[PDB]
Subunit: 141 residues, 2 copies
């Protein structure tokens, strides 16, 4: 029984701890948050055969912004531009092997944290907890 | 079912919304967080007959810090020094009427938030949620 604590305190403490833990792990990679999001998007959609325009449309950013971000990632050798297998007139942007390994590394930070939490509860309890959390969030929005 | 969201996201969003809401209300009072904590302590313990020493010992702060704090609050007429009913040699620090009203006002910010959340769940669900939250928090500590 933990009835002596407010929700505000519990949610603040939990959220603080998760952020601090994730941030300390992310600080070991020389990559910005926006670059991380870019690499993740490539991980999830590069099979589509992506142009810079596709990436801008997806990340909802302007062209020059996307150009800057791709330039830095390409310099770091985390992405590459390939010739397309079905249309040799075209090039696609995709991850390099090191880009793939990098995305899997920063995703595992988040997956490991989620699994630690999930393992504290039975499957039923986890489903009830997430449903109750979204109801609560909704009552604040 | 809300199984498509991570705990990190739900806890971050809920914690953000609560902080934002509380902060917006707190911004209407010309009082610092530390002053708020001082006023609350007086609200909770002024019956003991408090000196500045007692307040420092309780707030875990040094004497000069406490002195500065009390000066600002007394200037704002939120606290007063009384002659003690049992021992006329001594004076006690306590809230004024406007101090009491101010403490009740800021507490209500937090009480209202807690009650909105509590009202989303049954009594049993609230007890289970708080217990699960502390288990989760401990798995991070």
């Amino acid at each position: 029984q933990s009835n002596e604590f407010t929700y505000s305190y519990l949610f603040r403490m939990i959220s603080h701890e998760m952020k601090q833990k994730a941030d300390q792990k992310l600080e070991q990679f020389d990559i910005t948050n926006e670059q991380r999001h870019t690499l993740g998007y490539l991980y999830a959609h590069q099979q589509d055969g992506l142009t810079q325009n596709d990436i801008a449309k997806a990340l909802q950013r302007t062209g020059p912004t996307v150009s800057n971000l791709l330039r830095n990632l390409e310099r770091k050798k985390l992405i590459y531009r390939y010739v397309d297998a079905q249309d040799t007139r075209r090039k696609n942007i995709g991850l390099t092997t090191s880009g793939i390994k990098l995305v899997e590394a920063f995703t595992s930070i988040f997956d490991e944290m989620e699994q630690t939490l999930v393992s504290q509860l039975s499957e039923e309890e986890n489903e009830q907890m997430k449903a109750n959390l979204t109801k609560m969030l909704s009552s604040l929005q």
